[PDB]
Design an enzyme around this catalytic site. Structure first.
Site, short mmCIF file in Angstrom:
data_model
loop_
_atom_site.label_atom_id
_atom_site.label_comp_id
_atom_site.label_asym_id
_atom_site.label_seq_id
_atom_site.Cartn_x
_atom_site.Cartn_y
_atom_site.Cartn_z
N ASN B 146 -20.04 -78.05 2.88
CA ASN B 146 -20.28 -77.27 4.09
C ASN B 146 -21.64 -76.56 4.06
O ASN B 146 -21.87 -75.68 4.90
CB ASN B 146 -19.10 -76.31 4.39
CG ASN B 146 -18.70 -75.39 3.25
OD1 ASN B 146 -19.46 -75.22 2.29
ND2 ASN B 146 -17.53 -74.78 3.35
N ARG B 284 -22.22 -64.66 -0.79
CA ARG B 284 -21.11 -63.84 -1.28
C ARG B 284 -21.45 -62.35 -1.16
O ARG B 284 -22.51 -61.90 -1.58
CB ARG B 284 -20.71 -64.18 -2.72
CG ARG B 284 -19.90 -65.46 -2.86
CD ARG B 284 -18.64 -65.50 -1.99
NE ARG B 284 -17.88 -66.74 -2.13
CZ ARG B 284 -18.28 -67.94 -1.71
NH1 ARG B 284 -19.49 -68.12 -1.21
NH2 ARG B 284 -17.46 -68.98 -1.80
N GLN B 313 -11.57 -60.91 0.34
CA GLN B 313 -11.24 -61.77 1.48
C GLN B 313 -9.79 -62.24 1.33
O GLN B 313 -9.46 -62.88 0.32
CB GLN B 313 -12.15 -62.99 1.55
CG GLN B 313 -13.61 -62.69 1.89
CD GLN B 313 -14.43 -63.91 1.60
OE1 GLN B 313 -13.89 -64.97 1.29
NE2 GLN B 313 -15.75 -63.79 1.67
N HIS B 332 -15.06 -64.53 7.03
CA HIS B 332 -15.49 -65.72 6.30
C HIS B 332 -15.10 -66.97 7.09
O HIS B 332 -13.92 -67.22 7.31
CB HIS B 332 -14.86 -65.79 4.91
CG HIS B 332 -15.59 -66.74 4.01
ND1 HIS B 332 -15.25 -66.95 2.70
CD2 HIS B 332 -16.67 -67.51 4.26
CE1 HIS B 332 -16.10 -67.82 2.16
NE2 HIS B 332 -16.99 -68.18 3.11
#
Ligand SMILES: NC(=O)c1ccc[n+]([C@@H]2O[C@H](COP(=O)([O-])OP(=O)(O)OC[C@H]3O[C@@H](n4cnc5c(N)ncnc54)[C@H](OP(=O)(O)O)[C@@H]3O)[C@@H](O)[C@H]2O)c1
Ligand SMILES: NC(=O)c1ccc[n+]([C@@H]2O[C@H](COP(=O)([O-])OP(=O)(O)OC[C@H]3O[C@@H](n4cnc5c(N)ncnc54)[C@H](OP(=O)(O)O)[C@@H]3O)[C@@H](O)[C@H]2O)c1
Lengths: 382, 384
Positions: B146, B284, B313, B332
């Site tokens: 991704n 991050r 998360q 996210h």
């Protein structure tokens, strides 16, 4: 004479005391080689807010430096208004598209003494370009100033749609997470087909910019680009806009508003667009049929529409686009970023200078002079 | 073997029946030569929600033909966790960083037959890699999967901050106009200096993507890009990140989370940055002192911050990043757009094939194998 200037309301915190930055990049030259505005003196630090009533395009020193009359006002609507008041005896009218004092045929009739309707920014569509001719009047606009500004706005408004930014944002603002409901609408733009109506200063900017996103670049204009342009960017030319809207999942509109383009994106054209396609309209609202766009989103044939142009301007509180599903809208704010304000205000000066000192006005800045579409008008407008 | 896969809540209005598109592009190669996943088969249509519970990444027909057991939950907090429940006899664990199954040393201690801690996407930093090296475990992500999704998500965020989009889309929704209110913070990126912290797949992507905006392009990294890339992009390398952030009007962070990047952006670092700078963090969260961001933001020393990643998360509802002035935050998400799911749930698959089949797992995919950093992990990550 009386120079009359319609500018937008100040920020609700009143004219800015200080800004977010100490300065902005200095920009001298455009892509096609054209130079940034060249006034002899400017009376403002670039990067300041020039486009509101208080800002006054930093013009009051120069204009009452020949003790001319210089009125400023956000009041611009219907025949009792401050604008309509001073209108008839005014010789130079200045407004920006972001806050447009319109000049139809009757508002042109009343302006007995008007010699130069001067658009602070780009797109003189608020001005009845025909009437203008009838009264010998001259019309010029700061060409190039804010095209790069808009281009950045568009690309951004693309990614915001295709990836469904605003909504996912709306979640996190109100405490959520909701990933799953976020990415049901969230697609990469990568390897999609994307289409610019027109490839003028904006449309070419936008293309050059989307090219590194590894998408397949299509576009309609009334004349083609060079070969080395078309090859370097790797475009696919399209004679019909019909042609283009069948294959493209994203379309950016980047063409001026004149009767050719009026309502080009009416319910008619919406048919042939792929299900879940997207429209970014940064050019002019009346290139789309408002009530058509709405439905095709509600209907679901269009995944999303975003844009910063509306109609009228201001648009009425009740304007459906505002509340419409998945709207990536903003007010008309792309041409009048501080960065671009810098340039169209300069130009506004430059253009007043040549007019006041009898000397000529760049071809590029001229839409109408002497009863015909001249300069930029001739190539772009009908 | 038991397989234990942790996914995230389906949409509040149910897993969807239809999606507003009927297909997505066919990405097969990447910008470094590397191939996309090469699985043998799938059990999903490329472009359906896969990282949801009900998605099961198109596996529940693969694993059970082979005749292994397949667990799927979005309950991983507390002792209560269905997760820690099936943890012990779990031979293979899979999570996606968007709803990560945190594997601290407690969990990796109490995991008794785990051989494979696998990251759906990219970013294996929800896992102690030391615990993973000692417990002799093997670890993998879907490197590449991704990277491009993110690289777009950042750029949109850059533009979005620099031009004051959301504030102004707020004014749209609330039937106003108030132009001065929109543009009093709105700028063009044209001309500014932009720097990426890492210049990896993603950071490189962002560089190429930003180039035609006529910005100036800076970057830090432990090693350099080649003479060719540094020429054609007009890149400025820095040897200290301190020296980069000083000139950059905009910083994007595209580095892994690991000891060298943990709280890289403290108040000390943030201090050096220009007045009215912007950060984007699609990497991050914990590379920046959460708390120091907010200080800088409120004090108008940083004109904005934007990013999808957080810590933890999913995250508290009173995380101050949600409400801080001028944020452009998403949950996210960059990496689990549908276009990118169709790539990580194919890597997910392809690797499971290379395990049970007993063939080499793709070296690019490998974080920890043989009791050591290897692959991506050896070049990217580090351990105390
Ligand atoms: N703040 C904002 O949202 C903002 C700011 C600036 C400008 N704009 C709008 O965007 C427009 C574009 O300005 P620009 O920067 O692109 O400058 P430009 O270089 O004048 O671009 C105009 C282009 O439109 C093409 N064109 C004219 N009529 C057309 C038609 N019927 N169909 C298709 N293409 C047509 C022209 O090429 P051909 O003659 O070969 O077709 C030309 O390339 C402006 O006129 C304005 O209305 C909006
Ligand atoms: N949803 C999301 O937002 C999302 C999605 C995917 C990934 N990510 C994050 O993005 C990260 C980037 O990895 P990638 O797969 O995109 O490409 P990658 O090639 O795996 O990224 C590694 C790059 O970072 C550099 N790097 C590593 N440690 C560094 C350090 N301590 N200081 C500076 N640079 C360092 C490496 O170069 P050097 O060897 O020169 O340091 C290399 O260029 C992922 O690992 C993940 O944490 C976020």
């Amino acid at each position: 004479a009386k120079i009359l200037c319609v500018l937008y309301p100040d920020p609700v915190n009143g004219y800015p005391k200080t800004y977010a930055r100490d300065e902005i990049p200095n920009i001298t030259v455009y892509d096609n080689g054209q130079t940034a505005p060249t006034p002899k003196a400017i009376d403002f630090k670039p990067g300041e807010l020039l486009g509101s009533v208080s800002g006054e395009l930093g013009l009051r020193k120069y204009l009452e430096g020949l003790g001319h009359e210089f009125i400023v006002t956000s009041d611009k609507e219907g025949p009792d208004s401050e604008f309509e008041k001073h209108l008839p005896d005014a010789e130079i009218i200045i407004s920006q598209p972001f806050w447009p004092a319109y000049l139809g045929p009757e508002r042109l009739a009343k302006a007995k003494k008007l010699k130069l309707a001067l658009t602070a920014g780009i797109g003189s569509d608020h001005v009845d370009l025909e009437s203008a001719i009838k009264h010998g009047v001259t019309v010029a606009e700061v060409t190039g100033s804010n095209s790069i500004s808009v281009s950045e706005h568009a690309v951004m408004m693309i990614l915001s749609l295709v990836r469904n930014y605003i909504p996912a944002h709306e979640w996190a603002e109100k405490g959520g997470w909701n990933i799953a409901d976020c990415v049901e609408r969230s697609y990469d733009v990568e390897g999609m087909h994307v289409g610019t109506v027109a490839a003028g200063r904006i449309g070419l900017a936008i293309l050059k910019r989307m090219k590194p996103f590894d998408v397949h670049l299509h576009y309609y204009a009334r004349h083609r680009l060079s070969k080395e342009e078309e090859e370097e960017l790797g475009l696919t030319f399209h004679e019909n806009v019909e042609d283009m809207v069948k294959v493209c999942d994203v379309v950016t509109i980047n063409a001026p508003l004149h009767p050719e383009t009026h309502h080009m994106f009416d319910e008619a054209m919406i048919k042939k667009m792929k299900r879940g396609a997207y429209i970014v309209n940064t050019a002019r609202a009346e290139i789309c049929d408002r009530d058509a766009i709405v439905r095709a989103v509600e209907s679901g044939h269009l995944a999303g529409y975003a844009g910063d142009v509306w109609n009228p301007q201001p648009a009425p509180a009740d304007h459906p686009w505002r509340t419409m599903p998945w709207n990536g809208m903003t007010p008309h704010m792309s041409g009048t970023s501080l960065s671009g304000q810098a340039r169209y205000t300069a130009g506004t000066r430059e253009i007043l200078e040549c007019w006041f000192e009898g000397r000529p006005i760049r071809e590029d800045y001229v839409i109408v002079d002497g009863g015909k579409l001249a300069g930029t008008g001739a190539l772009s407008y009908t």
